[PDB]
Amino acid sequence: GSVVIVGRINLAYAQQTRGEEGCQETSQTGRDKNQVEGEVQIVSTATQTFLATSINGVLWTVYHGAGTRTIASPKGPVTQMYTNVDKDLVGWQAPQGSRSLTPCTCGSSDLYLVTRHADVIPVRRRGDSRGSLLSPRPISYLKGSSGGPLLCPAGHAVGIFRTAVSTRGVAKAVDFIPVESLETTMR
Numbered sequence: 416g417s418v419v420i421v422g423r424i425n426l427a428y429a430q431q432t433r434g435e436e437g438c439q440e441t442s443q444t445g446r447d448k449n450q451v452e453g454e455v456q457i458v459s460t461a462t463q464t465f466l467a468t469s470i471n472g473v474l475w476t477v478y479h480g481a482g483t484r485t486i487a488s489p490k491g492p493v494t495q496m497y498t499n500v501d502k503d504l505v506g507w508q509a510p511q512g513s514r515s516l517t518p519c520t521c522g523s524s525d526l527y528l529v530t531r532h533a534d535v536i537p538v539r540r541r542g543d544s545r546g547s548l549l550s551p552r553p554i555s556y557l558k559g560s561s562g563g564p565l566l567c568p569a570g571h572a573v574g575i576f577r578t579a580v581s582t583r584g585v586a587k588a589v590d591f592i593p594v595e596s597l598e599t600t601m602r
């Protein structure tokens with residue numbers, strides 16, 4: 416079926432636009448004539464819910480979430496533009512009404528992760544695709560936030576939340592797809 420937009424996060428505050436009946440319906444129809452807004456979208460399949468983030472006019476998220484699914488749009492289902500499984504990466508054309516995040520070039524190592532509750536979580540950049548959490552978190556607290564953005568102090572995109580780095584059920588750090596690798600994927 417289709418990936419369906421069921422909410423959005425404005426930059427922070429989250430909003431929901433669609434429920435289980437609507438989501439079950441639109442996952443199946445692929446037709447979503449709903450207004451789109453925001454930089455991060457809350458997105459659902461029939462089984463999973465996570466985040467997706469618009470960068471370079473492309474809406475990016477994780478493959479472990481999206482698979483090869485099409486996305487629901489006002490004119491019908493839209494196929495993926497990018498599918499790079501070894502990056503756990505998929506991308507569709509950013510739907511009308513989304514605004515893309517601007518890539519970070521300030522080189523800051525003080526990052527801020529946005530969760531599906533529109534909570535903003537401090538990260539210390541530890542390297543290209545790695546960030547350590549200042550306060551470690553339970554895995555289930557961060558479940559549903561993959562595909563969501565890591566920002567710099569200025570509000571620029573540093574990457575897309577992919578995997579959590581866990582010891583004994585506690586996330587001590589985050590793995591993210593950097594904005595440069597999206598560039599690489601696009602070319």
Ligand SMILES: CCc1nc2ccc(OC)cc2nc1O[C@@H]1C[C@@H](C(=O)N[C@]2(C(=O)NS(=O)(=O)C3CC3)C[C@H]2CC)N(C(=O)[C@@H](NC(=O)OC(C)(C)C)C(C)(C)C)C1
Pocket residue numbers: 463464465466477478479480481503554555557558559560561576577578579580581590
């Ligand atoms: C290798 C990644 C992967 N690839 C897949 C490819 C195909 C596939 O087929 C189905 C499944 C895959 N699963 C995958 O991983 C799965 C999915 C993914 C996941 O849950 N991602 C997030 C998250 O919030 N995810 S999410 O809940 O939003 C999900 C709905 C999208 C961001 C996490 C929130 C806590 N996973 C990890 O993050 C694991 N961490 C981890 O693997 O770290 C390593 C890479 C350093 C070892 C956990 C569970 C320990 C936290 C395991």
Ligand SMILES: [Zn+2]
Pocket residue numbers: 518519520521522523567568569571
């Ligand atoms: Zn920046």
